[PDB]
Ligand SMILES: [Cl-]
């Protein structure tokens with residue numbers, strides 16, 4: 001599913017991501033834009049043999065099981081395919097764990113490089129939330 005911008009904002013808010021660990025909703029929308037283009041089906045192989053999955057490009061080394069990443073820890077206790085669903089629940093729950101890991105949203109490279117320090121509220125402008 002490719003979410004609309006405000007559609008994704010509303011889903012993320014309903015799931016309790018807005019202000020989660022101090023990250024306002026626009027941070028999450030911005031991260032999802034650059035990680036996945038709001039596409040739940042997005043996948044990308046990493047150099048180390050792991051793969052990133054879903055709207056927030058969650059990695060198969062630490063977080064989910066994809067059956068092909070040796071040494072995977074599956075800390076979210078989910079198949080990586082669950083992160084591709086049109087229902088973002090599993091991605092949100094796992095993102096909450098990731099953002100609580102110690103480095104906040106710096107866990108998302110695209111957030112660090114393209115969202116952090118910018119006017120992230122722009123990402124939710126116009127939306128009815
Ligand atoms: Cl915001």
Ligand SMILES: [Cl-]
Nearest residue numbers: 021103104105
């Ligand atoms: Cl933080």
